[PDB]
Scaffold this active site. Structure first.
Site, PDB file in Angstrom:
ATOM      1  N   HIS A   1       1.145  -0.903  -0.116  1.00  0.00           N
ATOM      2  CA  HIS A   1      -0.396   0.092   0.043  1.00  0.00           C
ATOM      3  C   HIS A   1       0.763   1.571   0.006  1.00  0.00           C
ATOM      4  O   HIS A   1       0.607   2.537  -0.370  1.00  0.00           O
ATOM      5  CB  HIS A   1      -1.244  -0.087   1.189  1.00  0.00           C
ATOM      6  CG  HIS A   1      -1.756   1.217   1.408  1.00  0.00           C
ATOM      7  ND1 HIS A   1      -2.808   1.583   0.652  1.00  0.00           N
ATOM      8  CD2 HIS A   1      -1.490   2.432   2.246  1.00  0.00           C
ATOM      9  CE1 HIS A   1      -3.072   2.569   0.734  1.00  0.00           C
ATOM     10  NE2 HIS A   1      -2.588   3.521   1.587  1.00  0.00           N
TER      11      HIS A   1
ATOM     12  N   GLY B   1      -2.769   4.952  10.012  1.00  0.00           N
ATOM     13  CA  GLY B   1      -1.236   5.673  10.412  1.00  0.00           C
ATOM     14  C   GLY B   1      -0.555   4.098  11.084  1.00  0.00           C
ATOM     15  O   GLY B   1       0.325   3.423  10.904  1.00  0.00           O
TER      16      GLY B   1
ATOM     17  N   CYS C   1      -1.283   0.869   9.788  1.00  0.00           N
ATOM     18  CA  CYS C   1      -0.921  -0.064   8.671  1.00  0.00           C
ATOM     19  C   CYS C   1       0.721  -0.587   9.002  1.00  0.00           C
ATOM     20  O   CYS C   1       2.196   0.072   8.976  1.00  0.00           O
ATOM     21  CB  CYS C   1      -0.702   0.394   7.445  1.00  0.00           C
ATOM     22  SG  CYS C   1      -0.939  -0.640   6.023  1.00  0.00           S
TER      23      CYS C   1
END
Ligand SMILES: CC(C)=CC[C@@H](O)C1=CC(=O)c2c(O)ccc(O)c2C1=O
Lengths: 299, 299
Positions: free
Chosen positions: A40, A141, A143
């Site tokens: 991502h 945040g 991830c």
């Protein structure tokens, strides 16, 4: 006394890095000269479906920024593996612990180090549920936050990287090879997880803990064998029960067999109405047998 | 969603040591050139009331063994302060965090690093209850396990050393000055702690957290003022609610004053009607205002 705990996090804290690409920021894990993070980080800013194969081909090394406690690391090369990237960096992590990679199965407990901008802010234990999601506490945040277990000899098992929150609030991750647990997609979509099943192995361990704590108002004298209980379990939101002999330490004390507990579960399945077990108002599947034995006897 | 979490334990793990006196073994905390540990380590083996002033008088330095990772520190001198010892050693801990010492108050949350033979094995958050005990998970060997908080600046506040398990299973510790929280005796006896009250400040925080998740079936439209609630709290086993200032951040985002929540507490005081709030069937005083803000907003 049953308290959900995390194993100590210090040796994992030394491996967490901040990974930035363009304006996108998440966490990665630095072992040797390799940083693993969710892919991502290279996603374009857009609404439409992300084409990660395109993003990968247009990727430029100089757009990366990787740091540990503010100290920046040079990016040498990058390869994509499922839903993660493997970033080669110009120095090795000298605090790399002895470690392996393991994929979790439903029913497995592990530890989450919740991280923001490459800085750990919390640690908690969780269970991989039958629908391949976990019930974490994550905000924007987190991830790339890692999941791990520490084996008896001190070998860290790295098993989880946080990827996404689904609409229901359930959290989804991948293993370090980039397979998403439950094969959810690693981009926003309308996907819904399947129904949560009660982990029968944990309920049995819970009821053995209740017994060792003098709580036995609920005990049934009926017996249901494993095949019968497994057939009932399908019909009532429970998994099958794995084995009986793992519990024989617990059946020697207490004097109660697994088949009495399985009968007890079928009896308590409605609810305890007017009573509790170890302070719980319904059957608890949060604790494994390993946790019960460890927290009660240090094994 | 609200999950009980600990703060990462790495900086505290590097302070935990094994303190041995004769055959007695427990945990200590090594900061600079001082190890702090419970004074039980010099207790003789006996089933009678321990005279600690006599044990301190007969103490010999050569009987101590203090080690970290199987590496032995030289003991230089020992003084006794309430229920703790301060052992001066000949090496300073090079990993000593920036830190202060702090005495907890009821309603404060903190982190426990559970330790056995000087080795961390688990980490969990707890809450100091009104009878000055905590509900943790300890077995034999855990004494001297430290409790801590990490401030924004990275300062570690050391606030707790595990001392004793009571007959009820509740856990008692001291601060780093040697005062036992709640003034329990630091030795075997039949002491029984006074009953626990519900921490209203935390219940209010927990109801704000539910409003932030859309769980609001329980919301009273009516209000009670602080004076009326506190009079009600006295006669129903609840603490007095503090002020309405602190909840500005939550009252602002919810548009629900604390007075509506105090009214909701009176209504929900007995029975949720089978219903549920955030995974609980009765009110929960385990989360402080600061925890709810950090988990919903990162502040
Ligand atoms: C010596 C006697 C036969 C029983 C002692 C046992 O009850 C005990 C063990 C312990 O390890 C401990 C601490 O570590 C700290 C405070 C504290 O009172 C204690 C204890 O009383």
């Amino acid at each position: 006394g049953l308290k959900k705990m995390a194993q100590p996090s210090g040796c994992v804290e030394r491996c967490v890095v901040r990974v930035c690409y363009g304006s996108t920021v998440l966490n990665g894990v630095w072992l040797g000269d390799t940083v693993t993070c969710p892919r991502h980080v290279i996603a374009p800013s857009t609404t439409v479906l992300i084409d990660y194969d395109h993003a990968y081909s247009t990727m430029r090394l100089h757009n990366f920024s990787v740091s540990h406690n503010g100290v920046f690391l040079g990016v040498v090369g990058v390869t994509m593996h499922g839903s993660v990237l493997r970033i080669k960096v110009s120095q090795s992590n000298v605090h790399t612990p002895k470690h392996v990679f393991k994929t979790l199965k439903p029913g497995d407990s592990f530890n989450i180090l919740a991280c923001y901008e490459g800085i750990a802010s919390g640690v908690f234990g969780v269970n991989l549920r039958t629908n391949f999601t976990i019930k974490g506490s994550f905000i924007n945040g987190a991830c790339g936050s890692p999941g791990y277990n520490v084996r008896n000899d001190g070998t860290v098992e790295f098993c989880y990287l946080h990827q996404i929150e689904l609409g229901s609030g359930a959290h989804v991750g991948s293993d370090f090879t980039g397979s998403v647990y439950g094969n959810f997609d690693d981009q926003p979509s309308l996907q819904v997880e399947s129904a949560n099943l009660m982990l029968s192995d944990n309920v049995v361990a819970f009821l053995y803990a209740a017994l060792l704590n003098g709580c036995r108002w609920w005990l049934c004298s009926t017996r249901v064998n494993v095949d019968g209980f497994n057939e009932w379990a399908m019909a009532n939101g429970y998994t099958s029960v794995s084995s009986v002999e793992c519990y024989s330490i617990l059946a020697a004390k207490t004097g109660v067999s697994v088949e009495q507990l399985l009968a007890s579960i079928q009896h308590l399945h409605e609810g305890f109405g007017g009573k509790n077990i170890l302070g719980y108002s319904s059957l608890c599947d949060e604790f494994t047998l390993a946790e019960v034995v460890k927290q009660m006897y240090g094994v």
